[PDB]
RNA sequence: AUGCGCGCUAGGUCUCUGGGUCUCCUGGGGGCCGAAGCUAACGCGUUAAGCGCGCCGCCUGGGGAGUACGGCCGCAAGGC
RNA sequence: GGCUAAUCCCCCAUGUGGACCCGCCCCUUGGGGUGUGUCCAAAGGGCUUUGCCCGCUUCCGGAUGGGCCCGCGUCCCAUCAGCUAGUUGGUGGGGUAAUGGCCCACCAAGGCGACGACGGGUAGCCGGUCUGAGAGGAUGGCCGGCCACAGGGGCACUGAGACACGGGCCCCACUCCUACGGGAGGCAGCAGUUAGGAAUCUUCCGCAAUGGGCGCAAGCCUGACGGAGCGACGCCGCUUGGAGGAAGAAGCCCUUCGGGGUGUAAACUCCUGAACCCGGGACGAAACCCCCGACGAGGGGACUGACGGUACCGGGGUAAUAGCGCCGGCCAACUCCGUGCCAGCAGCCGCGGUAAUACGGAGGGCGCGAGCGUUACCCGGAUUCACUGGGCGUAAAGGGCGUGUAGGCGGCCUGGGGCGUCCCAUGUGAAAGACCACGGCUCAACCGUGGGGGAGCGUGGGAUACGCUCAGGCUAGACG
């Protein structure tokens, strides 16, 4: 069984990008659609669309990469240099508004899930609310 | 019987007093119900006595008693003045 | 008590000139002319590259040795400045230059830094009119440093002062020459300061 | 505030008394997982009102006996006997693990 | 170890054992010698080293090294024990404090005199 | 000398065994090379030692020693 | 055995009120009201005695202090796995201020335990401290809070309050008195003695200050306390001089025999003036008392020091203590001489068996400096118990394999709930400490005033993503 699904989307993406795929299909849920809305908005993924695959609905995430490179190893810089889950089933993390983290000195985000919704860090801090801290990205 | 007196908060040769409400039974320098002022003998400061009457009034109302020194200070600061 | 003994030696040891000698640590006798090499028999012998430790060490050495402080005082002063808000190197140097005896030197009442300590000690020095014999005294700007009216006439004091005519004084001060009082207007700065020392090296020295 | 807790009554055998059972989740102080511990409260049923597998509120009271400090406020849920079969069996397992 | 696993078992905070039963906890202990021997060091060196077996105030008995060059110690001397071992002498965990009770500071040693208990040399 | 479960991440080649529109494709199993990646190295590499999540077992310098004592099991041997 | 007083004891009286049984209302655990019925008070003393003060009695309330109860937190060993007879509940009862197996009789047969019961080991707990980048580890001496004990064990009495350290009864050990019958003790109060130990102070001053008991006061008490003494035990400040002064005296060290070194260091020149000696000389201290007004207020207004002739101010005045570790790498600082697997050093690597920068001195050098080394112990380093933050093919480490219990964990959609979670508000988070700010002692150490913070928990309000749950769908997992 998919055991943490969100961690598995984050991972479907991680694997996809390290082999530099153009797109990747991850199985679909509103909470993942949210997690992605934020990625798109934030610049990590190109976007995503929902699709039906043998009837079972999915979402293609479409990934961004840097331009090609020089010398040995032309392979373009990664846009998501990394992405890591935080609250996992069976150890959960929640953060009061005054523990919400500064990610790589701000050059990256942390998706929080909140009472008010699913948000980035600047988002909640300035929104003023805390939550279950899903993951971080740079 | 509850009281209003001086507890000694200074240093050696350099006293300073917290004028406090406490039960007589407690030690001089330990837990006390509320701090109502301070006293400086060598008067090394423009403000060497302070009170906040309304509080001291409240206590006298329910019947703590002062010391002689405490009462001296208090009246000086005019808890007692009825004019 | 502080280090009592051959000084122009430490002039030689840090390889640079930290005049603790006053006059003649100007006029070419400081021996740093024609004997800039360090003390002992091997002072003439070649030098082995310093461990990073050594570097850090002797730069803090210069910074202290200049001021005649004990280390206890020094390092306490330092940690005190680590705590104080904002950049530590500069803060520090501020706190050192703020030392009474130093200021009495800076103001040019005494020739040496140490002669100046003696001066504070016997309290020919007054601060805002109240005499102060404590060389460790912290001058806060706006304070006014005077020579003490009693000793105003002393041979040595007007001695220095006569040679102190027209000379400029460091910009975080001001002086009155014939009237021997002068005011300490601001905490000085890194640039505002001479010092022949990298301070960041000293910070790194207390890193460990 | 007098404290209320909610539990399931796991056994009745006592005259005028029921034993309720109260879980508490709470985060663990280092590892941080949420961990879920329980306690048996001996609670005072005056009327033999409440039965096995009934889920009730318990309220801090003036002591009834040694070990009985709590009385039964009201019935929240009637007849969840799974909870009971759980506790029953947790304890049926002590029968193993010894000599 | 999982986290479930970490709550239900959890880490083991490791103890340690004191390399010195001078013990009682104390920093030095007074004792009385038994044998005063001269002993043969382990494989890498070669020497003759002076040690005393000692009865303690702790109802305890050990060999203790005698630091310094010369010593006056006879079998009934009373002595103070320092602690610290010597790597190459089997069995000795404790040193002896010169200048204290019976063991007297090294004659003529001019140099590390805090150790070795000797006083300061007079001057003309 | 590689705990079980699931998802994910180039291919090639040999092969056992079902289904196909049977140059081949498509499941399931056994080997060998080898992307990316991992690894102290050797190696691992869709039959992970990669990327992940869940849960169990286990480790914490060598010798003393799988000894001693205790307990449990076993007719003994001797086991845990 | 006899005498007698009282604010000592007792009986009537009055009943503002109160207690209690029974009824009734409200309230809702034994809160409040109420109505009949029974029961319950008291002490006098001093004055300027016609009026005041000091008391006394019952009651309601306040306040401060506490009793008991509950949630939650609170070391190690599972080579401690079962523990339990007042033990678990029940009626009725005794006791108490008061709930309770707190105690008792009688009835039922329960209660606890792998979420660690029972057992063994260690331990006063906390504010806080030390350490750490933090998370965390360690600790609880002094100051503050709470507990417990007062030679060992038991028990009550008196009382508002104790099961009582300088109260009592009894058993026990020890010491002392003993006419051998029997008695007297109890420094874990301040000093002090003895022992034990590595080691831990004066048989001081004082009631002036603050506090406490009694007293109308005057006052008495106070080894609380405020001071002084002792010890570098710690922290902070301070001195052993300043400027001049050789192309650099002798001595001592090494030389390549030219000299390099100590080193401006000394000598000496000049100046200041630690110690020390005269003279003033404290604040800490205005109340209690005194008089006016009315013993209020308000107003005035006099006595009152241990520390101490100390602090400090003004005056005169002398060049006036330096020690300790280290110098092979870690680590800042190098050379001759002496020793020759010796004597020794040593924290780890490891030096010494002939030219030793490691041993033992000397010269020189580095580090600190009225200190500086050593030992013991704690944190650190140590991401070496890995929550942050580790691992398990060959380095230590996957159980021989499965079935499956407790337990952990859980696909997609919708809705109720709001337990987790989050936010706001407020209560609590004592003082000291810690951080910030000004300030007070010549600075600091020390102290004061003010500020701000804060995990956690109580309460009320709100949010509903995720987690939980309840209800309803789904089919991609699983089974058929
Ligand atoms: Mg879209
Ligand atoms: Mg984390
Ligand atoms: Mg009390
Ligand atoms: Mg700073
Ligand atoms: Mg800043
Ligand atoms: Mg300026
Ligand atoms: Mg540091
Ligand atoms: Mg029943
Ligand atoms: Mg009962
Ligand atoms: Mg059983
Ligand atoms: Mg594994
Ligand atoms: Mg293949
Ligand atoms: Mg076929
Ligand atoms: Mg295959
Ligand atoms: Mg097979
Ligand atoms: Mg490669
Ligand atoms: Mg890896
Ligand atoms: Mg290969
Ligand atoms: Mg795999
Ligand atoms: Mg071992
Ligand atoms: Mg072993
Ligand atoms: Mg075997
Ligand atoms: Mg056996
Ligand atoms: Mg048998
Ligand atoms: Mg065998
Ligand atoms: Mg056998
Ligand atoms: Mg008679
Ligand atoms: Mg009477
Ligand atoms: Mg009557
Ligand atoms: Mg009445
Ligand atoms: Mg009634
Ligand atoms: Mg009468
Ligand atoms: Mg009352
Ligand atoms: Mg009350
Ligand atoms: Mg209470
Ligand atoms: Mg209360
Ligand atoms: Mg508990
Ligand atoms: Mg403990
Ligand atoms: Mg054993
Ligand atoms: Mg019994
Ligand atoms: Mg009863
Ligand atoms: Mg009683
Ligand atoms: Mg439990
Ligand atoms: Mg403890
Ligand atoms: Mg104990
Ligand atoms: Mg800290
Ligand atoms: Mg710190
Ligand atoms: Mg503790
Ligand atoms: Mg703690
Ligand atoms: Mg204590
Ligand atoms: Mg205490
Ligand atoms: Mg308490
Ligand atoms: Mg006792
Ligand atoms: Mg005793
Ligand atoms: Mg007793
Ligand atoms: Mg009584
Ligand atoms: Mg009484
Ligand atoms: Mg009692
Ligand atoms: Mg008692
Ligand atoms: Mg006594
Ligand atoms: Mg008696
Ligand atoms: Mg002794
Ligand atoms: Mg003392
Ligand atoms: Mg007094
Ligand atoms: Mg008094
Ligand atoms: Mg009178
Ligand atoms: Mg007396
Ligand atoms: Mg005292
Ligand atoms: Mg000092
Ligand atoms: Mg000079
Ligand atoms: Mg010479
Ligand atoms: Mg010469
Ligand atoms: Mg003179
Ligand atoms: Mg006075
Ligand atoms: Mg006065
Ligand atoms: Mg007066
Ligand atoms: Mg008086
Ligand atoms: Mg009159
Ligand atoms: Mg008056
Ligand atoms: Mg007056
Ligand atoms: Mg006097
Ligand atoms: Mg003078
Ligand atoms: Mg001299
Ligand atoms: Mg070196
Ligand atoms: Mg040595
Ligand atoms: Mg020779
Ligand atoms: Mg030689
Ligand atoms: Mg050799
Ligand atoms: Mg040597
Ligand atoms: Mg060495
Ligand atoms: Mg040597
Ligand atoms: Mg030397
Ligand atoms: Mg020391
Ligand atoms: Mg450590
Ligand atoms: Mg650690
Ligand atoms: Mg660390
Ligand atoms: Mg970990
Ligand atoms: Mg954590
Ligand atoms: Mg490892
Ligand atoms: Mg092997
Ligand atoms: Mg292995
Ligand atoms: Mg194996
Ligand atoms: Mg296997
Ligand atoms: Mg299950
Ligand atoms: Mg889910
Ligand atoms: Mg809620
Ligand atoms: Mg709050
Ligand atoms: Mg506070
Ligand atoms: Mg204080
Ligand atoms: Mg100031
Ligand atoms: Mg402070
Ligand atoms: Mg709430
Ligand atoms: Mg909702
Ligand atoms: Mg919902
Ligand atoms: Mg369903
Ligand atoms: Zn010079």
From TrEMBL, chain E:
<comment type="similarity">
    <text>Belongs to the universal ribosomal protein uS12 family.</text>
</comment>
<dbReference type="InterPro" id="IPR012340">
    <property type="entry name" value="NA-bd_OB-fold"/>
</dbReference>
<feature type="binding site">
    <location>
        <position position="59"/>
    </location>
    <ligand>
        <name>Mg(2+) 4</name>
    </ligand>
</feature>
<feature type="compositionally biased region" description="Basic residues">
    <location>
        <begin position="108"/>
        <end position="119"/>
    </location>
</feature>
<feature type="binding site">
    <location>
        <position position="44"/>
    </location>
    <ligand>
        <name>Mg(2+) 1</name>
    </ligand>
</feature>
<keyword id="KW-0694">RNA-binding</keyword>
<protein>
    <recommendedName>
        <fullName>Small ribosomal subunit protein uS12</fullName>
    </recommendedName>
</protein>
<keyword id="KW-0699">rRNA-binding</keyword>
<comment type="function">
    <text>With S4 and S5 plays an important role in translational accuracy.</text>
</comment>
<dbReference type="Pfam" id="PF00164">
    <property type="entry name" value="Ribosom_S12_S23"/>
</dbReference>
<comment type="function">
    <text>Interacts with and stabilizes bases of the 16S rRNA that are involved in tRNA selection in the A site and with the mRNA backbone. Located at the interface of the 30S and 50S subunits, it traverses the body of the 30S subunit contacting proteins on the other side and probably holding the rRNA structure together. The combined cluster of proteins S8, S12 and S17 appears to hold together the shoulder and platform of the 30S subunit.</text>
</comment>
<feature type="binding site">
    <location>
        <position position="45"/>
    </location>
    <ligand>
        <name>Mg(2+) 3</name>
    </ligand>
</feature>
<keyword id="KW-0689">Ribosomal protein</keyword>
<feature type="binding site">
    <location>
        <position position="45"/>
    </location>
    <ligand>
        <name>Mg(2+) 2</name>
    </ligand>
</feature>
<dbReference type="GO" id="GO:0000049">
    <property type="term" value="F:tRNA binding"/>
</dbReference>
<dbReference type="GO" id="GO:0006412">
    <property type="term" value="P:translation"/>
</dbReference>
<comment type="subunit">
    <text>Part of the 30S ribosomal subunit. Contacts proteins S8 and S17. May interact with IF1 in the 30S initiation complex.</text>
</comment>
<dbReference type="GO" id="GO:0019843">
    <property type="term" value="F:rRNA binding"/>
</dbReference>
<dbReference type="GO" id="GO:0003735">
    <property type="term" value="F:structural constituent of ribosome"/>
</dbReference>
<dbReference type="GO" id="GO:0015935">
    <property type="term" value="C:small ribosomal subunit"/>
</dbReference>
<feature type="binding site">
    <location>
        <position position="44"/>
    </location>
    <ligand>
        <name>Mg(2+) 2</name>
    </ligand>
</feature>
<keyword id="KW-0687">Ribonucleoprotein</keyword>
<feature type="region of interest" description="Disordered">
    <location>
        <begin position="105"/>
        <end position="124"/>
    </location>
</feature>
<keyword id="KW-0820">tRNA-binding</keyword>
<dbReference type="InterPro" id="IPR006032">
    <property type="entry name" value="Ribosomal_uS12"/>
</dbReference>
<dbReference type="GO" id="GO:0046872">
    <property type="term" value="F:metal ion binding"/>
</dbReference>
<keyword id="KW-0479">Metal-binding</keyword>
<dbReference type="InterPro" id="IPR005679">
    <property type="entry name" value="Ribosomal_uS12_bac"/>
</dbReference>
């Amino acid at each position: 069984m998919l055991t943490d699904p969100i961690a598995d989307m984050l991972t479907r993406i991680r694997n996809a990008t390290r082999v530099y795929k153009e797109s990747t299909d991850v199985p679909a849920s509103r909470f993942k659609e949210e997690i992605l809305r934020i990625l798109a908005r934030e610049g990590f993924i190109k976007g995503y669309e929902r699709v039906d695959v043998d009837g079972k609905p999915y979402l293609r995430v479409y990934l961004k990469y840097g331009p090609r490179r020089q010398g040995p190893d032309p392979r373009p810089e990664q846009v998501i240099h990394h992405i890591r889950r935080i609250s996992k089933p069976g150890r959960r993390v929640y953060v009061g508004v005054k523990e919400i983290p500064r990610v790589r000195r701000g050059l990256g985000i942390a998706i929080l899930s909140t009472s008010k919704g699913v948000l980035t860090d600047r988002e909640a801090r300035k929104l003023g609310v805390g939550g279950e801290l899903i993951c971080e990205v740079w | 019987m509850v009281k209003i007196r001086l507890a000694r908060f200074g240093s050696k040769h350099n006293p300073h007093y917290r004028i406090v409400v406490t039960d007589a039974r407690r030690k001089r320098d330990g837990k006390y119900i509320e701090k109502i002022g301070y006293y400086d003998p060598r008067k090394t400061t423009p403000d060497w006595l302070k009170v906040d009457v309304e509080r001291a009034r409240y206590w006298l109302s329910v019947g703590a008693q002062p010391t002689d020194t405490a009462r001296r200070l208090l009246r000086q600061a005019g808890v007692f003045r009825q004019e | 008590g502080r280090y009592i003994g051959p000084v122009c030696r430490l002039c030689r040891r840090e390889g640079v000139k930290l005049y603790l000698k006053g006059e003649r640590c100007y006029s070419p006798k400081c021996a740093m002319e024609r004997r800039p090499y360090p003390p002992g028999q091997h002072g003439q012998k070649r030098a082995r590259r310093p461990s990073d430790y050594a570097v850090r060490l002797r730069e803090k050495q210069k910074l202290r040795r200049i001021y005649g402080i004990s280390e206890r005082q020094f390092r306490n002063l330092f940690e005190e400045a680590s705590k104080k808000k904002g950049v530590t190197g500069s803060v520090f140097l501020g706190l050192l230059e703020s030392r009474l005896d130093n200021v009495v030197y800076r103001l040019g009442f005494a020739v040496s830094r140490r002669q100046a300590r003696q001066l504070v000690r016997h309290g020919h020095i007054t601060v805002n009119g109240r005499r102060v014999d404590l060389p460790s005294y912290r001058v806060r700007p706006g304070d006014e440093i005077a020579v003490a009216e009693k000793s105003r006439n002393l041979e040595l004091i007007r001695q220095n002062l006569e040679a102190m005519k027209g000379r400029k004084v460091g910009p975080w001060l001001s002086l009155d020459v014939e009237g021997m009082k002068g005011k300490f207007l601001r905490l000085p700065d890194r640039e505002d300061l001479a010092l022949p020392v990298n301070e960041q090296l000293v910070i790194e020295f207390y890193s460990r | 505030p007098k404290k209320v807790l909610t539990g399931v009554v796991v056994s009745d055998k006592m005259q005028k008394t029921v034993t309720v059972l109260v879980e508490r989740q709470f985060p663990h102080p280092l590892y941080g997982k949420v961990i879920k511990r329980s306690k048996k409260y001996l609670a005072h049923d005056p009327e033999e009102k409440y039965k096995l597998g009934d889920v009730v509120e318990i309220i801090e009271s003036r002591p009834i006996s040694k070990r009985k400090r709590f009385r039964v406020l009201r019935l929240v849920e009637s007849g969840r006997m799974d909870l009971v079969e759980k506790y029953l069996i947790r304890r049926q397992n002590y029968e193993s693990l010894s000599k | 170890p999982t986290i479930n696993q970490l709550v239900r078992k959890g880490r083991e905070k490791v103890r340690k054992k004191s390399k010195v039963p001078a013990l009682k906890g104390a920093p030095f202990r007074r004792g009385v010698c038994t044998v005063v021997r001269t002993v043969t060091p382990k494989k890498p060196n070669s020497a003759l080293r002076k040690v005393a077996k000692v009865r303690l105030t702790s109802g305890y008995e050990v060999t203790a090294y005698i630091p310094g060059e010369g010593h006056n110690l006879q079998e009934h001397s009373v002595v103070l024990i320092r602690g610290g071992r010597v790597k190459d002498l089997l069995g000795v965990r404790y040193h002896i404090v010169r200048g204290v009770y019976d063991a007297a500071g090294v004659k003529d040693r001019k140099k590390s005199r805090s150790k070795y208990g000797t006083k300061k040399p007079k001057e003309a």
